Every structure is written in structure tokens, then in C-alpha cells.
RNA sequence: GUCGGUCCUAACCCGACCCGUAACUCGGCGUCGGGGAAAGGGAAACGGGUUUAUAUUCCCGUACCGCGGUGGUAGGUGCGGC
RNA sequence: UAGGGGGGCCCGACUGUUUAGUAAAAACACAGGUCCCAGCUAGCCCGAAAGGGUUUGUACUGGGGCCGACGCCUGCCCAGUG
């Protein structure tokens, strides 16, 4: 093991070749799910992923399809009828 | 819980002392009971960190003690500034 | 509120306590009387105010706390908002 | 006041969020129907009262109706979707 | 001779220096040519503990949008708005002048001359009082006991700093006091100057005892200012 | 092309302007700019064979990334669900 | 593979550190006690100056000495030196 792959930010992991080998393979770590901008709570309809693999999906399997995606769903509705109370006079 | 004499410091075992001991004991149990919230009237008020205080049930989250959420200045400056 | 009223109203009349059937009655119609506690969530007390003024129905804010509202009742919980349906022999209607 | 047939509202849940919408009819406690009603891009369709905000606007009409029918009262009335 | 740890912190290296990247930034509370008669008004979004400071800050976004920090009083809620200007009521947590601050009201982070910031009472725990107020000066108590004057459109916020009664629990163990100091690079541990040789401290030497009084003259040179400097007395009362 | 270096910043360092010094290849300095990690952050390749001695680098098989084109389509001007 | 045990006395409260290569200790440090300077263009300090450290700091803080966990206590003297 070399010395850049002995520092813990690779998860190994042994695998069994077609050869009877049993090597390691080294990968780099997921980044964590995205989370609310008010409340912090995680959001729904958002894939994890490193930046190779969200740039191998389409626009609308990235975010859900309703207004305010970064919002948890009551805090969307909370700024949606602000909004709507604002615009009465 | 089956101590009759120490509390959270028989941790320390035999050492450093009466009067260290019996004071860290006093002052971890007063802080480590749950606390009234000024916003909800609930009893659900813990120590976040040093000085930061914050309610489980409404998640209000407020500035005060090291070691409690009020202070006798602190409660004598409300009382004053209510007054005017 | 007054303990001998709303008491009178829980033993002869009807009461629906609690914040979402409250504010289901303040925006479909059914109730007569809201009463909301001073410290209640700000959404809950906006929404509630703001559907009553709409529907036409009266709204009393009960000075004390939801604490309190439920112990005055027979309760071991927080009420923060009530829903006066059926009054009777008692004169609650007449403080709002 | 009510949830009252003929009132116009903003649906707050959905793709069609931020959008007006005259109520038409009543089908439980917690579920009317609502049309677009070709204004703007809303089909008939039931949904729930926690889903809509009333506004104080309103509109006459009779407890059901249709959508050639409702258009009128809004060319009067005085209310654009 | 050699050198004493006073010298020697001087020089400013690295066995001395405060660790101040570790840090959240400095803490000021606007500048007069931008809040001139304006009473701007803020909202609290968050509540977070600095290394560098002893109280806890909190950071206030204003309605333009920018973001500052200011020290929190004790009772600041998060999602509650203040209000910093001449026009602000009487509440804690709001910044006013001070010839618009009644008497017997407690106060923290006082400016010096106007406009410079905030340089008084900014402890966890602290608190002065305003004594007088007069169209030269306002004279008010410090937390040492002494009084003093300020310019009347001098800044001030109103309450007490947040954090206090830190010393009511001992530190008990050295290596609690170990980690205490190397948060902020103090010298630790210390040593002691009757047990250095005599190339080394003024007192020192093999019997290990001050051979002279420990008082000693404010117009001594630097070198020589150990023990009691300048003292007007000594002892227990 | 796919492994590492060539990118980013950390603690820190340097230059110009500016100030000091009888002066300097000396001492400072906020700012402007530039540097600073082959175990921190950071696009993309795996298995089998081949040589006396190289191989995730040559060969066989089967893949991926970036840039640039060609030709069609979704969309612009579309929908299902409270 | 795998503890010999018990009773008295002196020092130091304890875990920790020390004379690389004749001293590991009863010496150092430690929590804690108490005294001194200082309201900030401060107090203490580096430097030939310019500038700078403590300082992204403000008396529940920063600097300077002596004793050294805990318990019971800490008497008299300001003529002399400071
Ligand atoms: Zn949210
Ligand atoms: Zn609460």
C-alpha cells in the first residue's frame, strides 16, 4: 500500500477477480444528502452523488417538479400563502 | 442513584478532594435537570454549549449562564427595563 | 375565560379541542366560538385569525397559556386552540 | 366567508402552485373541486382544503356548474385568473 | 544575563503568539457615516460559540442583506429582531446613544469616543450602570467599581452579556487547564522564579529564597520588574 | 486522455508602492499582485495474456470522461397524481 | 501461559516531567489559595528607528510574584532596608 492510499478518505474494498486473484479496490467517499435552507431537516427527490455521477442524469431526475425544491414542503407552503396574504390589497 | 454521599463525581473516584468534589456534584446536578422554556411553559430546556441553551419539544434556542439559563443580573436588568 | 363558563360548557354542551380541528371549523364553517391561547404558534394563530375574519366567526385570546387552558379543563396536555360548537345553560357567546 | 361555492382561491401545494382558482362544488368535509376553467392551465379536478388559500374575491354560481358557464360570471364580475 | 518569558513575548514568535485564525472575526457594530439617522432593523438567525471571546456571539442579518456579528446579551432569542440607531426603544439587546438612555439602566459595549466600535464591559457576565447624564457628559459605573465620563453620542447596548458564572466550578485536573490554554496559546505551565539560576531571574540562586524586598520601583528597568511593581501596600487587609 | 505531478486554498513566504536607516544583498508594512500540500480538497478503466528484463502504460476483449461536429427527438407551443 | 503476602515510620497529595552519555528523586509541574499593576493613545514588553507582541482581545479580562489536593489553623513588631 502506498502512502496516498493509506489515508482513510478511500474505503477499500476486497474483491474476488475472475483469475482467483482477490485484490483491492480503492474508491473515493459519497457526499451526504442535501438539506433545507430554514430548518436543516434532509430533502426528498434528490439523488446523492459525486459530481461524474449527477452529470450522468437529466434535469428533472435531479430536484422534484413543484415550486421552491430546496424547501422542505411545509416551509414552502408557509412562504407560498405569505405571499398570497401580501398580495391582497 | 447508589451513592449516598457523591454523585456525578464518583467518577472521580478517591481523588482531589471534599470540598472539589461536593462542588462539581452540586453544580452538574442543578444543570443537568430539565429546565422551564420561556416560549412554551414546557419543562424540555437543555445545555447546548457553553452559555447556549435550547428547547427539545418547540426548538427555541436562546443566549444565557455558564451553567444556568438566568443569572440574578440578568433577571434584575429585565425587571428594571420592564419597568421603563 | 372564565373556569365556571367553560366548565359549564364542557358538561352540558360541545367542545372540539385542538388546533387542526380548529382551524378545519374557522375555514369550512361549523363552529361558533375559537378561543386561542396568547402564546400559541404564530402560524397557527394567523391562520386561525385570518380564517375567522373571513368566515365570520368570533375569535376570544384566552390571556394565560396552552399549559393552563388544558389543566383548567380536565386534561394532562397543552390546548392551545378550542372550538366552542354547542354552548349551553352558560354564557361564553356573551364575552366576545 | 366559507369555502363557499364561487370562491377564488390560490392552490400552495403542487406543480400548480401560485395559480387561481374558482371553487364549484362541494364533494366531503375535506375534499371540493376546483377548475382552472380555461383561464389559465388547472383541469376539473378534486383536491383539499389544507391545499388552497381563499381570498375574499367570490363570484355567483350554483352548487355545481360548468366551465363554459363560469367564464361569464368572471367576464362581468370583474375577476381575471 | 539571559532573558525573561516577558522579554521573550516581545519579539512575537509563535511560542506566544495568539491563534487568532482559529477564531470568528472581530466584533463591531456599524459605522456612523452608514447608520447616521437611519435606526436600521435586524433579525438574529443564529447563536454560536467563539474560541477567542469568553462570551457568545450571535449573527444578525440586516434587511440589505449584510451579515454581522455582535455580542449576544443574555435572553436573545433566535428569530428576534433588534434595532441599532438613535430611534430604537429600550430593550435588551438593542444598541442606543447614550444620551438617550435613562438612569439606572445596565449597560454593555460602550465606545470610547463615538464611532469607534465598541471597546467596554464586553466580558461574559459583565454589565455597567448608568449613573448621570448631563449635555457634556454621562457618567457611569464600570465593572472594576470605577466611575467614568463619556461622550453623551457615545454607543451602548442595552442588558448583560451573556455567559456569566463561569468560575463557580474548579478546573480540578491539569490536563482541563492544559486544553484551556491551548485554545488561546497562553504560557503553560509556569515557572517559578526562586527555583531559576541566578543567570536567569532577578531572584534565584541555590537557596532558594527572595534575597531583597519583592517591591519594587515604577521607574525600574525593564529586566529588574518582577514580584510587586509599584505597590501602595502588601499583605492580607 | 483514465495512475501521480501541471488546478484550489491552509499555516506561512516573497515582490512593488510606501516608511525607516549614513547606507545596503538590512528592518518593517495595510493594500495590490504572485507563490505555498507527489498521504488535506480535487473529471474519467477493468479483467486476462505477452518479455531475459515494462506493464490499470504493449496486445485481446469489453468500458468511461472532456472538447468539437453530424443527424433525429423532448421542449419552445406537454402531462399524470388531493 | 500465569500475583509471594502482612504490619509500623519519614517525604511528597494524586496521573504526569527531569540532568541525550555515572543522579528518576524527597527536586519540577499540577488543581487550588492569596498579594500586586492597569479603564485601553492603558499596564507589562521587543527594537537604532519605522513600526510592532499581549490584540480578530477590554476587569468573570490581560500581565507580574509567593505558597502548593483536602481538613484544623495562620499570633506580636513599621525602629531599620524597601
Ligand atoms: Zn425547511
Ligand atoms: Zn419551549
Known sequence: ?89 | GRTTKVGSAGRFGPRYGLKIRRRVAAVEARMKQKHVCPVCGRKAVRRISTGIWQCQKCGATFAGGAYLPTTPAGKVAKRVTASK | DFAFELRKVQDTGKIVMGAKKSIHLAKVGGAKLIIVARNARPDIKEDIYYYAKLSGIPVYEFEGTSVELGTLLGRPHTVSALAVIDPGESKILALA | PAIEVGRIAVVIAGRRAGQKVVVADIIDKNFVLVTGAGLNKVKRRRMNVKHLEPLPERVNIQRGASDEEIKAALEGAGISL | GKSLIQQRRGKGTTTFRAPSHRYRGAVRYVPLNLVQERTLRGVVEEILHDPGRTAPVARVKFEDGTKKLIIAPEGVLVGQEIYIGPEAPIAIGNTLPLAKIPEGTYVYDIEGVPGDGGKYVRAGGTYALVVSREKDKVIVQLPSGELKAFNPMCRATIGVVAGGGRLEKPIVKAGKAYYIAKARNRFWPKPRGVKMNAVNHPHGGKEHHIGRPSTVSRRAPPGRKVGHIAARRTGRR
Open chain 1, 1 to 89: 500500500m502506498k502512502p496516498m492510499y493509506r489515508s482513510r478518505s478511500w474505503r477499500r474494498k476486497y474483491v474476488r477477480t475472475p483469475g482467483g486473484r482477490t485484490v483491492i479496490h480503492f474508491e473515493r467517499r459519497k457526499p451526504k444528502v442535501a438539506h433545507c435552507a430554514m430548518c436543516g431537516r434532509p430533502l426528498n427527490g434528490v439523488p446523492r452523488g459525486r459530481p461524474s455521477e449527477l452529470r450522468k442524469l437529466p434535469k428533472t431526475k435531479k430536484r422534484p417538479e413543484r415550486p421552491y425544491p430546496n424547501l422542505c414542503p411545509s416551509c414552502m407552503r408557509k412562504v407560498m400563502k405569505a405571499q398570497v396574504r401580501a398580495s391582497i390589497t
